């Protein structure tokens, strides 16, 4: 899940933070790929808009 997509679905960062329950700072602090715990709840608030995948959230090899 790319932050560029999330912000496009929410429109305003403050919105995303309100969906998950975090501050606006946390949203902007995000990188090319939103946190593993943020991308999760994000799939719920967006009504299952973005399908969560364990591709970029898999680092244990």
Curated annotation (Swiss-Prot):
<protein>
    <recommendedName>
        <fullName>Regulatory protein cro</fullName>
    </recommendedName>
</protein>
<comment type="function">
    <text>Cro represses genes normally expressed in early phage development and is necessary for the late stage of lytic growth. It does this by binding to the OL and OR operators regions normally used by the repressor protein for lysogenic maintenance.</text>
</comment>
<feature type="DNA-binding region" description="H-T-H motif">
    <location>
        <begin position="13"/>
        <end position="32"/>
    </location>
</feature>
<keyword id="KW-0678">Repressor</keyword>
<dbReference type="GO" id="GO:0003677">
    <property type="term" value="F:DNA binding"/>
</dbReference>
<keyword id="KW-0244">Early protein</keyword>
<dbReference type="Pfam" id="PF14549">
    <property type="entry name" value="P22_Cro"/>
</dbReference>
<keyword id="KW-0805">Transcription regulation</keyword>
<dbReference type="InterPro" id="IPR010982">
    <property type="entry name" value="Lambda_DNA-bd_dom_sf"/>
</dbReference>
<keyword id="KW-0238">DNA-binding</keyword>
<keyword id="KW-0804">Transcription</keyword>
């Amino acid at each position: 899940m790319y932050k560029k997509d999330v912000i496009d679905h929410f429109g305003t960062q403050r919105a995303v933070a309100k969906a998950l329950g975090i501050s606006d700072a946390a949203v902007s602090q995000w990188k090319e790929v939103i946190p593993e715990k943020d991308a999760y709840r994000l799939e719920i608030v967006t009504a299952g808009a973005l399908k969560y995948q364990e591709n970029a959230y898999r680092q244990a090899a």
